[PDB]
Amino acid sequence: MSPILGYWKIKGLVQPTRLLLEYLEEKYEEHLYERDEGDKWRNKKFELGLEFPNLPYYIDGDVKLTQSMAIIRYIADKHNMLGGCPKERAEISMLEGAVLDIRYGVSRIAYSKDFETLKVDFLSKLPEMLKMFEDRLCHKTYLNGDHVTHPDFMLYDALDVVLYMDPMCLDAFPKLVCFKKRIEAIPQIDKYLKSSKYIAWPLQGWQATFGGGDHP
Amino acid sequence: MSPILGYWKIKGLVQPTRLLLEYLEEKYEEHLYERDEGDKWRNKKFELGLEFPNLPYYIDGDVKLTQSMAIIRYIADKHNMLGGCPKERAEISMLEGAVLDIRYGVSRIAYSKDFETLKVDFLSKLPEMLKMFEDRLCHKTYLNGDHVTHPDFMLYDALDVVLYMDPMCLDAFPKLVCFKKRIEAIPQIDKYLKSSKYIAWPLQGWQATFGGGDHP
Amino acid sequence: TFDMNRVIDEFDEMTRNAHQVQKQTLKEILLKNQSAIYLQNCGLNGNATDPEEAFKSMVPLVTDVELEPYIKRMVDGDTSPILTGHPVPAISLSSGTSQGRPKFIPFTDELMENTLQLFRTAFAFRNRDFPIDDNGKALQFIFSSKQYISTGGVPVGTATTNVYRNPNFKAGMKSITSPSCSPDEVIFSPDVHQALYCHLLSGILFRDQVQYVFAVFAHGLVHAFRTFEQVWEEIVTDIKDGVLSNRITVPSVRTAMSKLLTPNPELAETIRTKCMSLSNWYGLIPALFPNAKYVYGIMTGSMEPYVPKLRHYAGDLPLVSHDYGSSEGWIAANVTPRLSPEEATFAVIPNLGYFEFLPVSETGEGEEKPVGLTQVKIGEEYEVVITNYAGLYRYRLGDVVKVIGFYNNTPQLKFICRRNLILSINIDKNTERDLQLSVESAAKRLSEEKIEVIDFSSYIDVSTDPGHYAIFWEISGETNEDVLQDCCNCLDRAFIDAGYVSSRKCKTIGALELRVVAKGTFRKIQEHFLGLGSSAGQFKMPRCVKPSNAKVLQILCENVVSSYFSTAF
Numbered sequence A, B: 001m002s003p004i005l006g007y008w009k010i011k012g013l014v015q016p017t018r019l020l021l022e023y024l025e026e027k028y029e030e031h032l033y034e035r036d037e038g039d040k041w042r043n044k045k046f047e048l049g050l051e052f053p054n055l056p057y058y059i060d061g062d063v064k065l066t067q068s069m070a071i072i073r074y075i076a077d078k079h080n081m082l083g084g085c086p087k088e089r090a091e092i093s094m095l096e097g098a099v100l101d102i103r104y105g106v107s108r109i110a111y112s113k114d115f116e117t118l119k120v121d122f123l124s125k126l127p128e129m130l131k132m133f134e135d136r137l138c139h140k141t142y143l144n145g146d147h148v149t150h151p152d153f154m155l156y157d158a159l160d161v162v163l164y165m166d167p168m169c170l171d172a173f174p175k176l177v178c179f180k181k182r183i184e185a186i187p188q189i190d191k192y193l194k195s196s197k198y199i200a201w202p203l204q205g206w207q208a209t210f211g212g213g214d215h216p
Numbered sequence C: 001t002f003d004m005n006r007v008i009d010e011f012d013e014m015t016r017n018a019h020q021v022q023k024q025t026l027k028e029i030l031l032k033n034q035s036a037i038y039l040q041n042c043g044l045n046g047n048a049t050d051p052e053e054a055f056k057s058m059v060p061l062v063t064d065v066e067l068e069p070y071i072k073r074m075v076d077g078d079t080s081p082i083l084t085g086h087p088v089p090a091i092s093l094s095s096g097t098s099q100g101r102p103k104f105i106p107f108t109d110e111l112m113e114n115t116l117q118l119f120r121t122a123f124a125f126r127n128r129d130f131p132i133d134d135n136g137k138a139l140q141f142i143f144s145s146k147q148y149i150s151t152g153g154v155p156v157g158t159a160t161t162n163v164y165r166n167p168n169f170k171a172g173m174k175s176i177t178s179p180s181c182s183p184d185e186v187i188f189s190p191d192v193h194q195a196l197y198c199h200l201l202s203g204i205l206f207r208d209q210v211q212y213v214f215a216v217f218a219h220g221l222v223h224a225f226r227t228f229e230q231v232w233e234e235i236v237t238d239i240k241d242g243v244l245s246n247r248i249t250v251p252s253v254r255t256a257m258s259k260l261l262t263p264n265p266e267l268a269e270t271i272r273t274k275c276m277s278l279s280n281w282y283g284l285i286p287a288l289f290p291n292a293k294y295v296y297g298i299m300t301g302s303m304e305p306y307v308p309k310l311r312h313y314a315g316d317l318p319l320v321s322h323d324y325g326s327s328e329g330w331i332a333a334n335v336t337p338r339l340s341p342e343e344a345t346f347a348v349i350p351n352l353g354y355f356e357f358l359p360v361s362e363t364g365e366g367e368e369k370p371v372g373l374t375q376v377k378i379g380e381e382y383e384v385v386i387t388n389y390a391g392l393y394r395y396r397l398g399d400v401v402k403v404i405g406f407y408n409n410t411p412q413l414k415f416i417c418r419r420n421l422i423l424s425i426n427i428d429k430n431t432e433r434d435l436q437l438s439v440e441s442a443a444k445r446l447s448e449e450k451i452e453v454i455d456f457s458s459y460i461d462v463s464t465d466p467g468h469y470a471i472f473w474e475i476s477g478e479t480n481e482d483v484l485q486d487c488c489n490c491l492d493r494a495f496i497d498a499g500y501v502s503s504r505k506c507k508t509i510g511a512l513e514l515r516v517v518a519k520g521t522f523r524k525i526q527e528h529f530l531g532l533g534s535s536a537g538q539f540k541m542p543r544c545v546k547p548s549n550a551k552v553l554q555i556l557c558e559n560v561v562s563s564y565f566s567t568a569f
């Protein structure tokens, strides 16, 4: 069976995996619950043969999968991009750690509490974390070298995320923007932005205090 | 130049790692920084040169890495575990991921002010994922094996910790208690459970209103 | 004061007296273009009873590389002409290239005077086969919105623009042409893309009376109606409410429309029902306007692949080919409006320039000795050489044409040129490989709004300290300004050559400036280039322009959708 990816009608944790399919030119199929189909999969949860009910899930010829951490790993390696050493798949995961803590970080409470009040305390601790990737990247085109990679894709989602959060988040580290554009530079992913599959927003769940609603 | 795992005297991110450094029978040394060594936190990170700043940190004689989830797969590959294997890497991670939802779920609440209401509902939401774990375990002794891997103590940390906050959450799952029974049964871990190195509390940094503080 | 048959009379008598009139005009340029030390050290001194034959062997031919240094003088800091005549009001970039570099030709007053006269001959001959209403207006895609000041403090400008912004534009064209849909202010408007849809809207507002639909070539109309096909629902929603959309940011265009904006629910209903009913958007031009006579533009040479799609848009209506002319000079005119575009051919104007022709025939190519235009042999192909008042003396464009026939004694021509390409070595290189990857790289962010890039260019600015960047971009539709800023940064890191990229990184060359020119700009310079007096096949676009290039230069500073210096560094 050909690759089947299911996810919420949001970019979400699923942007890096959908985006990684296209840099890799991997072809995929999509089943997405719309405005109220999320509840319907109740009956479908234990009848899917899936080990642990949730989204995303992944039915192919070879395996039954779910969750963002796991799916990114499984797809990339078959296509030779999960990592090459004890040191660097770790480095990958660490860089994953860096984007996720900041991204799962915006999402602690972006659809919860007063996001603006909690914005200020987190936008108080972010400069170091943002400044770390900009200093490491001066000699390399991206974080790890010369061919675009998946840490960059959650990172792509990432850069979008503090900038929609805070427009002038990025006033003092200019390198990241040209760099996002260089990962965005690959022809195929551009065309899918061009194509019908591209969904600009919301990044998080539909009902979000911040980043929520059908229309910006 | 014995390998350094550097971290606070807290369960948190490092808890799966300590016991597990002993599974591979690998040499290691510790730097213990206390609640009162917050002054240490400002002054240590870049003085030894971290590109990606975070705790916990672990340096083998040649490696530089942080972030709990990243540290774990690090330990596993040194134990020749990756190479790659798909299902399990994606299934360990899924298994791990359900618990990351559990582990970071408690960490979400970890800095929260109320705690009790978030936990009981965290408790209300625990039987789903545990049942997903439960329906994994019966044919064999533990979560995915015969003789201990890395993913064990994390669910354990998760399940151990959750047993402390509520005494009867594991009552309906007999297979999970043998599971609890099984790792305290293997020679190295129970033997070191009574040693000075063993760390039981607190679950999060002492700042947490619950699972912080002092007494089990 | 235009008389329809009198202007054709001047042309008709002229075609009959072509030989005499031409040697006189040869005498004219010779009497006029003289005292530049270039002409005299080439040997010229004036007059005699010996002005033609001795000239061709004696006085030397020119190419773009040799022509490059002398206006280079004029454009840079100090206006110092030595090969043309007067210090030029504006300079013109010529098509093809100079060893991979920008081409140089001066633009004079006579052309604007020649513009009025050639066109005057054109439409009058057209009017005998296509009678017109004198009180009507026309739908024309003509833009003169961009002007720049040279490093020497001199204006540089495309042929077309220089004419439109000239003090004599209105008096010279009041009697002889049907009014533009868009106000002149809108033809001069900072946003030609926005001017493009509003002028188009302007057309629909007076659909019953319009007699023309105009651009210089076919594919520009084509892209326009794709846009119309793309944004027509956008047009009618604006009309129902009577409020112009918020996509539109430019000061002059929104105020024009606000005055022209009255709630018209009904028109939007009429247009909407009619527009959706048609199948596969083939030929919407007469439907929108029930009384228009024709579609006007260039339809030969490189336009042949674009002829079916204009035909696609044209349907059953007669196709009229625009006269063949340029910033170098005006060379030919269509005096046979009834004939189709494929068999169409353009009449040489006797008094505008001395044309001699470099022989191609015996093998490939040829060095055979040249002959006069009327003295040229029927049915054979030769590459034109031009001596005129644009300071061009024996200038080889590098392009070959065939003789279809004769309006009396003056030849009509067909141009099978679709590429005249020959090249050498460029030192603003930065090759196309790298530029194409770079422009394409920065392209995706705009593409998030389903908009794609039409065209690209770059510039060498020695007025500024330091010499630097300057990028041109044409896209299908309007977009916000912040995505563009970031695009500038990709372009900033995209060019990868050691010298350039090291300087770029530490701002030894200024931080990249991104200015978004409006749509059809490059299309308009393409308009100029195919018409280049020669063999109608001359459109290959220089991708980075020296202080030395020219069409592109006028364009860069004012007509900015937005202008931003690097959001990097």
Ligand SMILES: N[C@@H](CCC(=O)N[C@@H](CS)C(=O)NCC(=O)O)C(=O)O
Pocket (backbone or CB within 6 Å): A008, A012, A013, A038, A053, A054, A055, A056, A066, A067, A068, A069, B097, B098, B100, B101
């Ligand atoms: N931490 C877990 C949980 C992530 C998560 O919340 N996934 C959502 C999709 S955005 C889900 O599966 N929800 C299932 C439901 O609707 O109950 C993971 O990374 O997969």
Ligand SMILES: N[C@@H](CCC(=O)N[C@@H](CS)C(=O)NCC(=O)O)C(=O)O
Pocket (backbone or CB within 6 Å): A097, A098, A101, B012, B013, B041, B054, B055, B056, B066, B067, B068, B069
């Ligand atoms: N995802 C990251 C986030 C880790 C994190 O926030 N760590 C805390 C320790 S629990 C920290 O370093 N805090 C800095 C401090 O309190 O000084 C990871 O797991 O490493």
Ligand SMILES: CC/C=C\C[C@H]1C(=O)CC[C@@H]1CC(=O)O
Pocket (backbone or CB within 6 Å): C115, C116, C118, C119, C142, C160, C163, C215, C216, C322, C323, C324, C325, C326, C327, C527, C528, C531, C532
């Ligand atoms: C009267 C000529 C004025 C300007 C130049 C151009 C237009 O306005 C339409 C085409 C015409 C000829 C060309 O292509 O050189």
